[PDB]
């Protein structure tokens, strides 16, 4: 009751700090509660550009990975390339002979993962047939041309004999063989190019085979051609053999691609490639990977935060904030 504290007494108070401007977080007890400090755990901002200093980034510009492979004339700059990540632009196009690839997606996946377009030419013998067939739909500069990695075979004189060739794999790695079949526009065209009325391609190893018939009919003009080619691949394993038997319509390989078990891939984006630092890439550009989570894109490559729906998650980095007065 005495206003002046005693000399024989003292007061001791215990307390904790508080800051002027707190910040709201969520707990198990509270929708919102104010803490002294907190951290953002979700990355929502990308750099707007793809950094090319950590991984080898290859800009495909006007070319799809597949076109670069086959040897589409306007993709000639991509010969023997290798990458960690290949960028396919939306504006990309094809400018050679019209084609399709049954299971296109798989072949793209395989090559993208391999991470290389190393190509060794092999000396196949095509006894008794015309080689290096070309088209006006596939201009190499001024000249009619064809896919650089493919060999369009036709009759010589008045015949097209039964082709039967072999190619053994005496190397320490898997060979990838890209080959195809041609589909003419009419029976008249079929017998004009191949003599036989029913073409036939058989490609085989010791324990596997693929057998294809050509398709005949009128189709829409693509760069002046109603004919088409279908693409096929074959993996020959070390110790195995490659065999090709055909009585017509064969679009022959020129050699093989080296297959690797790599860490590579392919990504679709229209975002510019630029010098900077980053170990994680998305279609929206490189992103920082300090934060455990990211809200930028479900498609990622490299050392990436996990993608989640939420644009923000706040983690308390301090105590409940109870301001003065």
């Amino acid at each position: 009751q005495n206003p002046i504290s005693n000399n024989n007494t003292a007061t001791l108070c215990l307390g904790h700090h508080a800051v002027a401007n707190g910040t709201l977080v969520k707990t198990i007890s509270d929708d919102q509660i104010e803490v002294t400090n907190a951290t953002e755990l979700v990355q929502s901002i990308s750099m707007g550009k793809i950094c090319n200093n950590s991984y080898r980034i290859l800009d495909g510009r006007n070319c799809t990975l597949i076109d670069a492979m086959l040897g589409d004339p306007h993709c000639d700059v991509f010969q023997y390339e290798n990458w960690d990540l290949f960028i396919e632009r939306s504006s990309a196009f094809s400018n050679c002979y019209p084609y399709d690839i049954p299971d296109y997606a798989s072949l793209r996946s395989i090559v993208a993962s391999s991470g290389t377009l190393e190509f060794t030419a092999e000396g196949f013998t095509w006894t008794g047939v015309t080689q290096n067939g070309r088209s006006g739909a596939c201009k190499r500069g001024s000249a009619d041309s064809f896919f650089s990695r493919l060999n369009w075979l036709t009759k010589s004189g008045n015949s097209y004999p039964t082709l039967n060739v072999t190619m053994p794999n005496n190397k320490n790695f898997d060979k990838l063989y890209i080959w195809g079949i041609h589909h003419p526009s009419s029976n008249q065209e079929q017998t004009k190019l191949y003599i036989q009325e029913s073409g036939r391609v058989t490609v085989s190893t010791k324990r596997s085979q693929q057998t294809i018939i050509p398709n005949i009919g009128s189709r829409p003009w693509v760069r002046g051609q109603s004919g088409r080619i279908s693409i096929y691949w074959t993996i020959v394993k070390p110790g195995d053999i490659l065999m090709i038997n055909s009585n017509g319509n064969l679009v022959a390989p020129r050699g093989y691609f080296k297959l690797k078990t790599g860490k590579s891939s392919v990504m679709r984006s229209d975002v510019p490639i630029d010098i900077c630092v980053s170990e994680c890439i998305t279609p929206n550009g490189s992103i920082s990977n300090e934060k455990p989570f990211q809200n930028v894109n479900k498609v990622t490559y490299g050392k990436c935060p996990k993608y989640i729906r939420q644009n923000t998650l706040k983690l308390a980095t301090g105590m409940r904030n109870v301001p003065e007065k």
Binding site: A10, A18, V25, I28, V35, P292, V299, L313
Partner: protein
């Protein structure tokens, strides 16, 4: 808080404390004063510091994966690709929501606990020489200079030498 210290029997926090998270304020014949407690602060900070690293693996590389965007309708194979990705994303979103909620809950409770523990550590030292005023304050019932407050703060306070004085001021 479950211990009822922070925003409990301690009314508010001290903005003018910048040298620690917990501490003391005191008044005696030599005046008033403020001092941080570093052991309490340190215990709290160590538990909070990069606390996620204890449950989340150091971000690792992921290379070639499945396609997640499609330009054509294909049907069965694409449905599955889409369903698998939608499933993965939803599960990780839940993990994230729950982890943050739990971690925050833990942060409140542990800092609240440190406050409480520091209080009870002080009470025990003082024995019968002091009473609890409420508000997290102690009324000490003996002459108690800065050097004495110091011995409380560093854990070397000897109640026995002040007891007779204290019991006399408390009960007469």
């Amino acid at each position: 808080g479950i211990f009822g210290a922070i925003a409990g029997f301690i009314e508010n926090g001290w903005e003018g404390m910048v040298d620690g998270w917990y501490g003391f304020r005191y008044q005696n014949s030599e005046g008033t004063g403020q001092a941080a407690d570093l052991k309490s602060t340190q215990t709290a900070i160590d538990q909070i510091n990069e606390k996620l690293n204890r449950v989340i693996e150091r971000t690792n590389e992921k290379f070639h994966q499945i396609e997640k965007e499609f330009s054509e309708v294909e049907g069965r194979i694409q449905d599955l690709e889409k369903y698998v990705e939608d499933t993965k994303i939803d599960l990780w979103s839940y993990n994230a929501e729950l982890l943050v909620a739990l971690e925050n809950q833990h942060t409140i409770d542990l800092t609240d606990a440190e406050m409480n523990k520091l209080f009870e550590k002080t009470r025990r030292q003082l024995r019968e020489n002091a009473e609890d005023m409420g508000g997290g304050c102690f009324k000490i019932y003996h002459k108690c200079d800065n050097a004495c407050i110091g011995s409380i703060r560093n854990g070397t306070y000897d109640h026995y030498i002040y007891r007779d004085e204290a019991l006399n001021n408390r009960f007469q």
